[PDB]
């Protein structure tokens, strides 16, 4: 296992290509029919920042939940006493790129529970091994992970 380099994306293609997580299908708002296709994640071994205090960060697609749950396990295994942490899941704050996969629940921004930025390269490596369809060392403060639609 080698940590991803700063700004490295795996696989080596645009996020929204067929080879990656594939195309933006559209924004999901709290009204929408599609809102109901979002599972809240209550895995007790995942820290959700939820600074919004709405629980938005827990909402994601089935596929996102699955990869996130797998990564939760490999993070506890990688560092004794550390957990996966989510800063963003589904988003209604418009805090992303114009057509973020966050706006339809197909992306998470992640850290370790200790916010040790030296761990974050290895964290991205784990998110690839967990089966995220696109991993990106997006900033010094987070790894962005996304998934194909259902």
């Amino acid at each position: 296992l080698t940590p991803l380099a700063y700004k490295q994306f795996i696989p080596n293609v645009a996020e929204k290509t067929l080879g990656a997580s594939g195309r933006y299908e559209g924004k999901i708002s709290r009204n929408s029919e599609r809102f109901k296709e979002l599972t809240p994640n209550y895995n007790p071994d995942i820290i959700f920042k939820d600074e919004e205090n709405t629980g938005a960060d827990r909402l994601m697609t089935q596929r996102c939940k699955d990869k996130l749950n797998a990564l939760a396990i490999s993070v506890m295994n990688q560092w004794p006493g550390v957990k996966l942490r989510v800063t963003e899941g589904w988003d209604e704050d418009g805090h992303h790129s114009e057509e973020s996969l966050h706006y339809e629940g197909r992306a998470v921004d992640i850290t370790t529970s200790d916010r040790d930025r030296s761990k974050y390269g290895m964290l991205a490596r784990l998110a690839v091994e967990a089966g995220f369809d696109w991993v990106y060392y997006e900033s010094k403060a987070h790894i962005h992970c996304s998934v194909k639609a259902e």
């Epitope: 700004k7 600074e51 997006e138 900033s139 987070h142």
Partner: antibody, heavy 119, light 108 residues
Amino acid sequence: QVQLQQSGPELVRPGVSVKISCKGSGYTFIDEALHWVKQSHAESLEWIGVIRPYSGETNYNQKFKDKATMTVDISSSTAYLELARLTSEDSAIYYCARDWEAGDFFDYWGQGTLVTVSS
Amino acid sequence: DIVMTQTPKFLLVSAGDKVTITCKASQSVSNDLTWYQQKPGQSPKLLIYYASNRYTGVPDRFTGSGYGTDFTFTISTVQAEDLAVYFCQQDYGSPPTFGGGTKVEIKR
């Protein structure tokens, strides 16, 4: 509504220290890092450093290593900047600013504290 | 430390016209480039991050581009209320560093 409320303006002699403050409201204080930014005519904007309230970890611009101390009081949701051994180059507006854990850049700024170093 | 050179230093521009500001870094800062707007008497306001993303509620007229050393900030159709000093800031290297700023003044 997130707000950073800074302490009032300060006149200090060269050689004296001054401690200014920045109180965070409308969010959970330990959720975000706090930064200090100096605005002078001489040097325009310069990053002094960052404190992480959650860990009390600090990182200083080496230019300010000897000049600046950052601390927080988690209880009052207040960050402090202490500037020691001041000269007229320290006269400036000092801001605090918050990141949103997406990189070291800042969506919320205090109104700024004008420090005049003068005899 | 990374030096950000911002040009021009001043622009005078009529409502409806284009503003183009350049920031060049002394070495590559990937896309870790932020643009702020400081209106007279105020604190800086963040408009653009990761070189090209608009912060929430920032209008369409504001755009950024670039990767590496060479970055561009545009106001497609400057309005009266856009008078301000614009600054870039890199956070690729430690410490973060800012450009010396561009003052935009309205010709009427």
